[PDB]
Amino acid sequence: NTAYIDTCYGPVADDVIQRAANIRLLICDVDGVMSDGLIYMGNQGEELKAFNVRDGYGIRCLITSDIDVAIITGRRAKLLEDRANTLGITHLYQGQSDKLVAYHELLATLQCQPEQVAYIGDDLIDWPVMAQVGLSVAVADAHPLLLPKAHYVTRIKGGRGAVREVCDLILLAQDKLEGATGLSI
Amino acid sequence: SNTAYIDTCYGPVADDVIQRAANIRLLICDVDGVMSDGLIYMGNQGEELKAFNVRDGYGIRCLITSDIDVAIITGRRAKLLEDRANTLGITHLYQGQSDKLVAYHELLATLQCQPEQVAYIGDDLIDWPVMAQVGLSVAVADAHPLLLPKAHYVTRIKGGRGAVREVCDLILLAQDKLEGATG
Amino acid sequence: TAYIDTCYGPVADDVIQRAANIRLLICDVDGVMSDGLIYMGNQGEELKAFNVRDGYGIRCLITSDIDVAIITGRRAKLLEDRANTLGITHLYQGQSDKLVAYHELLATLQCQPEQVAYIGDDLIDWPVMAQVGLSVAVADAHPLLLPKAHYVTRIKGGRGAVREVCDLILLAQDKLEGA
Amino acid sequence: NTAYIDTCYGPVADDVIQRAANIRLLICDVDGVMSDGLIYMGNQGEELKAFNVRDGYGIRCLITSDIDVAIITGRRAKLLEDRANTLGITHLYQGQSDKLVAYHELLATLQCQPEQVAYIGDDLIDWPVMAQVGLSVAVADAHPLLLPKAHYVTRIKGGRGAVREVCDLILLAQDKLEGATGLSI
Ligand SMILES: [Cl-]
Ligand SMILES: [Cl-]
Ligand SMILES: [Cl-]
């Protein structure tokens, strides 16, 4: 007889709400989480990535509500530094093959406990970190093997507002949703 | 209850909604998630792209040529949007607006429109302060879940896929101007 | 009504017969060869996305002695490039009244209206579609256009709706297997 | 009474599993397989193609598991050489009008039997090669006429992780899935 709470994305288990209430740091993977997993490449070496505006708003709400937001990704691109800058994200880790290193560095840097960390991932590479945190999240269309492992599976797909969904959940859990705002720096 | 509905090419529409659309003299659109899918394309050399829908363009032209004003209010700022606005003949463009109510009040004052004569299409919470005040508030099909139950009308078509066109068509139909409209 | 099975599902015998007479395929661009999106950038860049399977269908028609033309209201050099990569030599851009180009194609190619197929996605395409042998609306064309066409594709614009019509025409003309 | 094996993508026939167990070389077509079939063209002659990071991880898993990966396409673009370089793919054939020419070179140079080859296609142009291999694969949204011809039809659409799905199947079939390692690029 699990207890659930209605949210604007559907019912969420009380255990998940309780985990979300302790979050002081949200860590996000990029490709497949903030985007639908696509990398656009051109003939003169151009590269584009598509980000979702609604996720941006969620990220700003967290940051303005004293909840740190960090990024850990295996890829490396100037465009992501630009994106992080527009969102006010100062903790960006690119070109990371082993995500635990960046994760442990964040814990020490921010003097945060693992139970105070939420992590949104989409592939197996994310699991070693997700296995240790207070709130592990797999996006709706994450690799099938990651889905049953996470504390929460988002209703929204990667690149369509899965990050916003987790931002909304964390703020709801901490009774900060009604008053939160996400204006730019 | 027993609500009356009018059949439209997008499905049944409440009579209440048809009456609201019948009085529209100004359509205000948010951009990201309304005229687009909600995505921003960013590149390594600082390039930025946004994708607009051709079908929306046609609808906007039908409104403008039918003496129905169209305006854009957005918190973002990009030359690409000035370009898009120009191609559509939109002369009421407001970018970098953190408080959308400022631009909204200026438009009503300058265009001599009453709030009941204004329609607004949004996709997120920042659009609600303006939507709360207008005659026809519209949330796109895939708008943030919290906005959906608040709007007078929710489009069947998703943001960036013709949700703007759908509203343009609804307004024209409600005013007996759908047939004969050119865009 | 008699239906004939196709790799896209049953097609009415009436449509197969119409397809069998086609000598010219005319396509609109936005919403037909693409999903209706136009990408715009801050330095004035513009992109449009085309479907590779559609390209193959077009080449099959051209090599099977069936002409392929394009009539669009927009104008962009990117479209000239696409047309050229497909071997399309009949391209009409910046066309406000699509009937003008249509009547010109009939003359240039000494073609009859019943020998023309037209794939559209919006109301501006109807004046021409109303007059041809095989009018086609893409799966996700404007709702008002859908019930007016002789055939509605199962595949959406930009996802292979053009290839579908190409396959249908060739099937009807016993030219599919050898294409 | 066909026997099936449950995979993270759903049941897979025992016949397909046995075919996947013998694979030493995976050949991929590009457009509609590694991408959703779209070509982006610009007014200044720019050209872009979008690849999926989930597929990159699968390819790296194959290569690091001593399973070769090759690409054969009729198109030609510098962007594809760039994508192949990022994935460590060294067997790249572009502008190939007759795909069988490249296919025969690969088997000869790699000392690989047709039965040891898997090929992922999306259109009729791919059939001459698929007809000859041990594991022919059509992506979920491949041209309708190719679907009934392949040994296996992927659950995932072109450009959304159909390649990854095949990489996972081959590894599972060879008991190398759990130990597989790759990078989300
Ligand atoms: Cl944003
Ligand atoms: Cl337009
Ligand atoms: Cl092509």
Swiss-Prot record, chain B:
It comes from the Bacteria. Its EC number is 3.1.3.45. Mg(2+) binds at D30, D32, D123. Pathway: Carbohydrate biosynthesis; 3-deoxy-D-manno-octulosonate biosynthesis; 3-deoxy-D-manno-octulosonate from D-ribulose 5-phosphate: step 3/3; Bacterial outer membrane biogenesis; lipopolysaccharide biosynthesis. Keywords: Hydrolase, Lipopolysaccharide biosynthesis, Magnesium, Metal-binding. Substrate binds at D32, N53, V54, R55, D56, G57, R61, R76, R84, K100. One of its GO terms (molecular function) is metal ion binding. SUPFAM superfamilies: HAD-like. It catalyses: 3-deoxy-alpha-D-manno-2-octulosonate-8-phosphate + H2O = 3-deoxy-alpha-D-manno-oct-2-ulosonate + phosphate. Its cofactor is Mg(2+). Catalyzes the hydrolysis of 3-deoxy-D-manno-octulosonate 8-phosphate (KDO 8-P) to 3-deoxy-D-manno-octulosonate (KDO) and inorganic phosphate. Homotetramer. Belongs to the KdsC family. This is 3-deoxy-D-manno-octulosonate 8-phosphate phosphatase KdsC.
Swiss-Prot record, chain C:
Its cofactor is Mg(2+). It comes from the Bacteria. It holds the Pfam family Hydrolase_3. Substrate binds at D30, N51, V52, R53, D54, G55, R59, R74, R82, K98. The keyword Ribosomal protein does not apply. GO terms for biological process: lipopolysaccharide biosynthetic process. One of its GO terms (molecular function) is 3-deoxy-manno-octulosonate-8-phosphatase activity. Pathway: Carbohydrate biosynthesis; 3-deoxy-D-manno-octulosonate biosynthesis; 3-deoxy-D-manno-octulosonate from D-ribulose 5-phosphate: step 3/3; Bacterial outer membrane biogenesis; lipopolysaccharide biosynthesis. Keywords: Hydrolase, Lipopolysaccharide biosynthesis, Magnesium, Metal-binding. InterPro entries: CMP-NeuNAc_synthase, HAD-like_sf, HAD_sf, KdsC_fam. Its EC number is 3.1.3.45. It catalyses: 3-deoxy-alpha-D-manno-2-octulosonate-8-phosphate + H2O = 3-deoxy-alpha-D-manno-oct-2-ulosonate + phosphate. SUPFAM superfamilies: HAD-like (SSF56784). Mg(2+) binds at D28, D30, D121. Catalyzes the hydrolysis of 3-deoxy-D-manno-octulosonate 8-phosphate (KDO 8-P) to 3-deoxy-D-manno-octulosonate (KDO) and inorganic phosphate. Belongs to the KdsC family. Homotetramer. PANTHER family: HAD SUPERFAMILY MEMBERS CMAS AND KDSC (PTHR21485), N-ACYLNEURAMINATE CYTIDYLYLTRANSFERASE-RELATED (PTHR21485:SF6). This is 3-deoxy-D-manno-octulosonate 8-phosphate phosphatase KdsC. It comes from Yersinia pestis.
